[PDB]
Ligand binder design. Sequence first.
Ligand code: SF4
Ligand code: SF4
Ligand code: FCO
Ligand SMILES: [Cl-]
Ligand SMILES: [Fe+2]
Ligand SMILES: [Kr]
Ligand SMILES: [Kr]
Ligand SMILES: [Kr]
Ligand SMILES: [Kr]
Ligand SMILES: [Kr]
Ligand SMILES: [Kr]
Ligand SMILES: [Kr]
Ligand SMILES: [Kr]
Ligand SMILES: [Kr]
Ligand SMILES: [Kr]
Ligand SMILES: [Kr]
Ligand SMILES: [Kr]
Ligand SMILES: [Kr]
Ligand SMILES: [Kr]
Ligand SMILES: [Kr]
Ligand SMILES: [Kr]
Ligand SMILES: [Kr]
Ligand SMILES: [Kr]
Ligand code: NI
Ligand SMILES: [S]
Lengths: 279, 482
Amino acid sequence: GERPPVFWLQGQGCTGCSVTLLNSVHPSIADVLLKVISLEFHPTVMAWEGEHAIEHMRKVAEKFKGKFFLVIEGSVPVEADGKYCIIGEANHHEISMVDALKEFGPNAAAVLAVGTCAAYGGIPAAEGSETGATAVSKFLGDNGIKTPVVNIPGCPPHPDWIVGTVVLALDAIKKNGLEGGLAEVVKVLDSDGRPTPFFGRNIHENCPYLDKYDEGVMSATFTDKVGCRYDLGCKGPMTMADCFERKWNGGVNWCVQNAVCIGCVEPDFPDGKSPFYQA
Amino acid sequence: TGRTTIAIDPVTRIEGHLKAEVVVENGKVVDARLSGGMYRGFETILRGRDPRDASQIVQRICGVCPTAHSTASVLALDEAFGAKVPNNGRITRNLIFGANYLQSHILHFYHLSAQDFVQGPDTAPFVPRFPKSDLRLSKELNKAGVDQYIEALEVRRICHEMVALFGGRMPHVQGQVVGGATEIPTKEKLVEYAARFKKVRDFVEQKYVPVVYTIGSKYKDMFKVGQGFKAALCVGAFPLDNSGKKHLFMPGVYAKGKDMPFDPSKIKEYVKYSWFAEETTGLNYKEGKTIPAPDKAGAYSFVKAPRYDGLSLEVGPLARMWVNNPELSPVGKKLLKDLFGISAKKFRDLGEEAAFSLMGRHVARAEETYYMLGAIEGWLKEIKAGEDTVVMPAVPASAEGTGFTEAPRGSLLHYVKVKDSKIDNYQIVSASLWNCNPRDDMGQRGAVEEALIGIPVDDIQNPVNVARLIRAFDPXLGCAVH
Ligand code: SF4
Ligand code: SF4
Ligand code: FCO
Ligand SMILES: [Cl-]
Ligand SMILES: [Fe+2]
Ligand SMILES: [Kr]
Ligand SMILES: [Kr]
Ligand SMILES: [Kr]
Ligand SMILES: [Kr]
Ligand SMILES: [Kr]
Ligand SMILES: [Kr]
Ligand SMILES: [Kr]
Ligand SMILES: [Kr]
Ligand SMILES: [Kr]
Ligand SMILES: [Kr]
Ligand SMILES: [Kr]
Ligand SMILES: [Kr]
Ligand SMILES: [Kr]
Ligand SMILES: [Kr]
Ligand SMILES: [Kr]
Ligand SMILES: [Kr]
Ligand SMILES: [Kr]
Ligand SMILES: [Kr]
Ligand code: NI
Ligand SMILES: [S]
């Protein structure tokens, strides 16, 4: 089959969701780029630059109207008429993330909001912020764009969650065609827009220290790995993700083993999960 | 007038949102403005929180260098809490962080910079590009470039496995906190760490450091541009003892040919040309304030303008290898001879002009990667399985602290003021702030804006050397603005 065209736009992101993708193990990132997708615009890694890069994205977008996938990393700031995130300049006119999402969002086959920033607002929308950081879905609904949106959250997401969502959706489309599969993709989303293969299970319900939680056996220093981390601030109890099983960075560790879960996949992250180091 | 203005937005194969605007006359850059176009306001987000929350929140400034902000944060927290980090935890911090130096330098040369000189396969994201892209490598060497880019994708992923072993995950480690590191190294995981380390060691020794010198030899003109102010800052990093005295990189400033010691009170942040309230200009970080002003006439950037005793300085691997003047790697000593006919033992033998050059900065970064391999070996000798790595201090009611370190891209400090057991102020002064900033209140250009002066643009249709210069500083605008 064909590798669909993908455009990856960064709003108020830290580039963490591109880096975590580079850590994908099976398939590696190179297989993703050469065999799974055609990444036509990504400002961190692409060859061309500036106005030419934007005009290349717009020619592909015109060519493949309704058929291209848009990845959005980072949140969308709406205050100051979008001046808190300018992402480009073409034709002597600056382009805000507000502009870009209104340009490209209505013509994408689907939008993948990658990371908790994009999915839910996350740290840029947190108490103390001033920029109007808005989640992608809210922004699209707010300007009346109906393109389906998939949330792949995490700060950062696990690479397997990103790759995995893409492969599920591209197989659904191969199976059912494009309208058909995207309905099958939407069918597997929870009430927060997240795919249930990865965010369907609660951390706490599956933690290997659940025995100790129930025994009331609690570690009092981080370096004591026998007890449950609850008293140290573990937010497993309110967090739906599968890191307990697949773990992180080629399986060599994960947040509950090393320290605590800070609940980075959840819509209330970070404020509703803070303080991080008290229950 | 004979002056032609080129604008590039986005600058790609950097991190974050950057617009570059140059003016070209007689085929050479004669004036420049850099615009960091995206703001989040971490310094106001953090106020009112439990201070321990900071060592997580601040990492989300930058997913490429989150361990630098973690490190800076927990040092500020350590000082503010009065926490005496255990020795074994000092070293475990060093191992978490040093490993991302390797990831970050490998990421930058191969996956950000190398396409300035190497043509990728004929598929996106490697095409389309400038029709006259100025790519000089032979079919044989270009295929070397390509295969090593692909190998480096594995090498950098392994580096993050090394970070994660004692850090919990990467990006955004859980393993560094006030008081030390959260997970004592076991014999087992030290084995997994050293196993990965060796693969990275050999790729650094055998592929990365040669390929930089090799590609430079095909671009010797690129050692002759990009000098800017020839002024550099290092603020110290990776403590080697528990007294605050010896560091792998020791502090120092270089300006006007003069080495001088580093005095942090001489840091001030100007905002005349930055989108912040005019009344917040000229503040040292302990008194810093972040009041966004996105409509302020004359301003063109979300990056403040830091100056050291009024000097505009640059930071990063060049700056550190210059100040500290270590010995060059053996492969660097040899290849500087065979390919450049140059004889040199320590870093400053390359000379001011070649070191402070577009291709000089790439060379510094490769040399520093090698140097870091030695540090990591040493700490792998020193760490001791089983010894505790953390203490559990109480949050003070009122306190302040400052953490100084060097991020892969240069000097970093976090400052925290605690009041009523909550963050009252948190100020960040980061590496790409020193490099990618606009003009200060005195009209003096930022380091990169100045290094852009005299860059050749012989073909305005293919101004490839403008971004080539910028990429040599390894910019990340997330860190510059936060
Ligand atoms: S509180 Fe955390 S460490 Fe304890 S059982 Fe739940 S997820 Fe596990
Ligand atoms: S363990 Fe918790 S904080 Fe760590 S990645 Fe999973 S959901 Fe995020
Ligand atoms: N490296 C890195 Fe990030 C930047 N610039 C910091 O500090
Ligand atoms: Cl880092
Ligand atoms: Fe700052
Ligand atoms: Kr990517
Ligand atoms: Kr990246
Ligand atoms: Kr690739
Ligand atoms: Kr890449
Ligand atoms: Kr995608
Ligand atoms: Kr754009
Ligand atoms: Kr969808
Ligand atoms: Kr992907
Ligand atoms: Kr993707
Ligand atoms: Kr899915
Ligand atoms: Kr997809
Ligand atoms: Kr999708
Ligand atoms: Kr390349
Ligand atoms: Kr090469
Ligand atoms: Kr290369
Ligand atoms: Kr490649
Ligand atoms: Kr050094
Ligand atoms: Kr040189
Ligand atoms: Ni950074
Ligand atoms: S960075």
